[PDB]
Amino acid sequence: AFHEVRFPANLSFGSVGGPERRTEIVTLSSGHEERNSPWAHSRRHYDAGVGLRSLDDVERLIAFFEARGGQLHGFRWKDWAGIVSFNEPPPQGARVTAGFEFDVPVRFDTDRIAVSVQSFQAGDLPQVPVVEVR
Amino acid sequence: AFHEVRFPANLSFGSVGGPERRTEIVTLSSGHEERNSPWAHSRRHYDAGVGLRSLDDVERLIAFFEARGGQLHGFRWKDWAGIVSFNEPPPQGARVTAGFEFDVPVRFDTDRIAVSVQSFQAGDLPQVPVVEVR
Amino acid sequence: AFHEVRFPANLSFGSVGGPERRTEIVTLSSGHEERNSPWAHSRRHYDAGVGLRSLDDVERLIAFFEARGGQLHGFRWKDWAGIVSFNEPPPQGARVTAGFEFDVPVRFDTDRIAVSVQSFQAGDLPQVPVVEVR
Amino acid sequence: AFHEVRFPANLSFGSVGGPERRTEIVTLSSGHEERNSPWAHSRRHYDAGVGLRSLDDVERLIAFFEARGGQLHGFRWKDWAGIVSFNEPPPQGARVTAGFEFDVPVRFDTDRIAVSVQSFQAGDLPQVPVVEVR
Amino acid sequence: AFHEVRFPANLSFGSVGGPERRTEIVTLSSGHEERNSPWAHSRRHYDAGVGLRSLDDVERLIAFFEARGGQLHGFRWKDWAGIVSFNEPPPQGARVTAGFEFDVPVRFDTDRIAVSVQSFQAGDLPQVPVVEVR
Amino acid sequence: AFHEVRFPANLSFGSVGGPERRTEIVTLSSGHEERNSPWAHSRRHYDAGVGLRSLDDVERLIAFFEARGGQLHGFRWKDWAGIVSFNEPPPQGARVTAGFEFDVPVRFDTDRIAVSVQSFQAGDLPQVPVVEVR
Amino acid sequence: AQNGKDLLIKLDLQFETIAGLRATRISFNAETVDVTSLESQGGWRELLGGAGVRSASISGAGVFKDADTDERARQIFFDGEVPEFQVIIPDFGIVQGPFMITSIDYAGSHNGEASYELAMASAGALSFTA
Amino acid sequence: AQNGKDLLIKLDLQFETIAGLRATRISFNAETVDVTSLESQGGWRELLGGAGVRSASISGAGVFKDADTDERARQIFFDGEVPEFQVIIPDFGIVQGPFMITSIDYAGSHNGEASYELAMASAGALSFTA
Amino acid sequence: AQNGKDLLIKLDLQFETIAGLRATRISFNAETVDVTSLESQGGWRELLGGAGVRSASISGAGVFKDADTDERARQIFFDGEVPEFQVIIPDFGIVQGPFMITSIDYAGSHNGEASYELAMASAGALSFTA
Amino acid sequence: AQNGKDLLIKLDLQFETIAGLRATRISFNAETVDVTSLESQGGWRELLGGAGVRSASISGAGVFKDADTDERARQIFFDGEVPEFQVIIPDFGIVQGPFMITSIDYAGSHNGEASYELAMASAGALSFTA
Amino acid sequence: AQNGKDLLIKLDLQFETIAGLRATRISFNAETVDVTSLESQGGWRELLGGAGVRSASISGAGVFKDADTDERARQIFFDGEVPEFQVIIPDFGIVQGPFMITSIDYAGSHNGEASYELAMASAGALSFTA
Amino acid sequence: AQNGKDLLIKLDLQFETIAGLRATRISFNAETVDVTSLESQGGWRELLGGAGVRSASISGAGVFKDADTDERARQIFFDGEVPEFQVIIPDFGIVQGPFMITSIDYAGSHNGEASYELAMASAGALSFTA
């Protein structure tokens, strides 16, 4: 786990991601249901990042996966979407922030990455999913 | 179960959903077959909601899933489609409304949501399937 | 089983359906075959109905599934394609009509329906398959 | 098995079909392998017929499946592609014709058919696969 | 196995095919690998032939599959791509030619073929894969 | 393992490939989870090479797979993306280069190749996935 | 010969023509349901005819003169309706169909008129009075 | 040379030409079934010829003069038929084909005519009387 | 008759027309939600009407004369807003709608003007003052 | 300079030009098989050349004068063939290729000619007599 | 009124206008990010505004007079750069944006000029000097 | 100013211009590789520049005068090659690039010339002699 950097600045339009829950459920077949939640929290689970710049940006991006990545390190993630609460219901969010200001430490959900060449200097990679391990 | 709010007002064209019937069935290989249902109601089972507004609407929408949501709470749902009966047959609907005026309390059929950024201010999420648990 | 009504008048171009048979078959691997038919009749098996009108037509259509439907009732079906025989071969059809004049009592082949909103007043649902239980 | 008629005249562009050979095969993982076939003929195996005419042609076509069809009868099939031999190799075809002049008695490879209505008078059905059972 | 003819002359743009190997492989999980080759040769494995001419060419093509084909005969295959060696590495190809001049005797990889009619005189069939059995 | 040549010069736009990490993972259903990798390197895992030139280039390319290839030989690979370190984190890459100057010896991830003819002189093959075995 | 001044489109409120009616054009259509079977005596395309849907479209141009029938079309557009419209052919007669008000547009220049196009399309079954 | 007044389209009811026949144009087509094998003596595109479907399309313009043959085309459009149509070529002769009435349109302006286009397309096998 | 000088588009800052306003054209639209059931008394296309979305688009041409209302449109474009716009129809009245500033363009030649087109489209519910 | 009267298309029956030959245009084509490898000395697009298929198309306009060569083209269209066609270039020479008769059309107006376009396309390997 | 001779595009090397500058046209754009929720007070289309990407495109025409600024554009094209470009509006002021050199073309006839079009498009954030 | 008679395309056989060279136009292109990240100082579109492929296309019109350089282009088309082509710009200089002969066409009328268009496109890396 690191505190190394946010990310390369570029993120394409389509960087999707939202919180998860396990919340297993029985669906009582002759009436309503009853369902349990063991979390009290949520994995933010950001997906579908895309790097799109010159090939000068690519070699600092492929080794972003490699050098400080490996598999098992932080690389605090920037959200385009210390405790934050959500007060728009009379309920509350009250979800903690271990890192400062929406920085949500994560890890990539990939055994490999796949960078493509689109033109003499175009570097693309279609997806880098994350799940924000604590 | 809550009585918190309807929803964000915006719903895209394509918000699908209609009643779901157990309809346990035998399918005799001879021919005609019998069947019965144990509900005497119908889960309305609304799907494919889409939030589309600015990013100011997104942070009150992502924590809508989180804060009063979790997984297991009401958030009464607005239908664009106290007891209502349906008299267009000589049979009857006679289906109850626990909440007032088509408000059908539900829950989202998702372990996670997936909000996307499509431009500097565009916030999109493709689907939030519900089933109106009693 | 009912005798309630035909259907809403509207049916989109593409309402497909034709008769079935079980007619299990062995395909004798070193020559021709031999095959048995236990029916002497045919399930007409109409599919792919689409309701397309205003939202005023939708609430008399969603409860068509619900009120006189449930799961296990008739709602005599209108064919755009008392005993009728088919004499264009020297064989014969000789297929009975329990209901009058091509009215083929059926049931919907769905646990749920799925009505969509296409515009301020457009109501659509893509399919309602039937099999004409006796 | 009948000798009733050829078919409705209409067949759309795309009526595919060609001989099917048992070709029991061993596929030795070393390399080359041997094989043999027990037919000494070839099931012609015609597929993808389409009826396209007015709705006056449809009721003589849906009961073509039903009346003389059922599942298990002949209805001699017309090929747009008494013993015929094939002499373009120094080998020979020498394949028999039980019926006269390319009439290849068959059966449909379907438990059901599916006729569609595409306009006030348009009748379509996408496929009627046969296999020319002897 | 025959020596009958090459093929009909026509072959569409897209007649794909290249050599094979079994070369089973263990992928030693904590380092590099080690892998074995039992062939010393290669199956050329040509695919995706297409006949496209008039219907006069079709009846000499459908019985090409049938008459000298059956399943288990040669029909020497023409490559648009006596021992040939490949000297562009300091290694060597040294791959034999049992037939003369790139003629690669094969067999079709099909239990059936599927010839289509595209217009009054157009005859098409999408694929005839081969593997060049010795 | 060879030191024979780089490759044919041509590579189409879309030659994808990036490091692949074992990343054995436990995924505790509680929440956060631990992980470790046994490599201390990363298989570069290049894919989707395409040869596109005249048919004069094809016969030196199909036997590139065959002659010095087989399955189990080097053919040092050119990257369009002696020890190289990556210093953009305070961590380090420090990944070795057994061959000089980004030459990454590999092997193709294919039992067969598939070269196509697209016109009188056009030679294409869609993919040659490698993994850079040490 | 027939005068182009005679053929007139007209709205309901009872039917009155609109004010600026510089150029108008009813246009009918059918989508030609192709029924091309493999057999055809010379390989000719065969068509079905009556299976095709049939339509009508009215494109009226004119200069903006304020009339109650011109205000009516704005009210038909904002309160989106499909009322009865009627188009005379000089010596044939009227059409008297339900149409909608698909796209209208008002235009003006630094020197010219207040002009408008008015595009309509069929919304139901039409008629013919002979 | 041949007069453009001579080539005439005509409806059945027995054949009579329509009234306003300002400009007419029979147009034949074939879709050119490309049969391009890999072999070809210079890499030239080879074509099959007779496999292609073949068509005909008639586009008649004119001014609306009321005639029974002009009323017939309206009746052919509403009661959607594919009757026999006949087009003379001056010194070739007639065509005498089954066509449909694909799209007609009546138009009029504030100052001009009641004019009409009449677009037809082939519906069957055609002929030629020489 | 109505003068084309009378119909005026105007920005907010309180409403003032822009300087070069050589040709302007409000254009309304509806996408015609086709509801064609199998039954229809002659096979005619049936339409729903009020289900269709409805729009407005303003295309203003003119010569670049510097005004505060002309500078305002640049500020509306860079600071991307959807403010209220207002278009008079001579004897109908104003429209007073929220629009955006979809595409503007400034042009100049070696001999002519500094000219500009200004294309707008609807952004909300419109109005009508009568 | 070369006279446009000199370049002549001509049918077989032995070769004779058609009667109305107001404007004719042989047009060759190649589809430009793009072979753009990643390497290229300035990022320029590289092309292969000889791999591309190559074609020819003849578009002949003219006025309908009845000739046996004009009747021949009708017979070539109905009995769909791909016979030899020949087009002179003034000082180059003939082409002498197999073409088909892709689309012809006869047209006439209320005041003008019986005119025709005749569109052809390549059907085989062409030639050049120099 | 503003002279069209005043609005000038100019390259860097410090800024100088190009030689043949017969007609030039800066053109801005925005793609109009449609945010049409089901609710809308009359079924009107709602738009977001500031979410849309915004662009600029320069199309300069002119006659080829050799200048160092004209040679610069060739060097900008071959050595593909995105340098600063600057376009005056007469009484607004300059723009001073980074653009690229998307497509240029030189043309000449047997009797006319050596002429050229020069098409540019936005490459970064723009400015405005007022 | 530069004469349009000065800019000349020319073939190899050593370089000579073609005979009918009525209008010629070298046209360069780049496909504008859009690199629009979410961050951008005003939401402006960002572009990369040098990553884009770059091209050239020559469209030469002229009247068919028989020359060896005109016969050469036919030989370049039938024996499909990509030889060196060279285009002078008056005071810039030559280009000297490898092109292909993408589409040529010969045309003639009943009264006019034997004319031809000659369309070329880039096939390799280009140059510039200054």
Numbering used by the authors:
A (entry chain C), B (entry chain D), C (entry chain C), D (entry chain D), E (entry chain C), F (entry chain D): 2 to 82, 157 to 209
G (entry chain B), H (entry chain A), I (entry chain A), J (entry chain B), K (entry chain B), L (entry chain A): 3 to 15, 20 to 136
What does the paper say about this structure?
Gene transfer agents (GTAs) are DNA-containing phage-like particles produced by some species of bacteria and archaea. The genes encoding proteins that form Rhodobacter capsulatus GTA particles (RcGTA) are derived from phage DNA, which has been integrated into the bacterial genome. Here, we use cryo-electron microscopy (cryo-EM) to determine the structures of RcGTA before and after DNA ejection, and to visualize the interactions of RcGTA with R. capsulatus cells. Particles of RcGTA have heads with a diameter of 38-nm and 49-nm long tails.
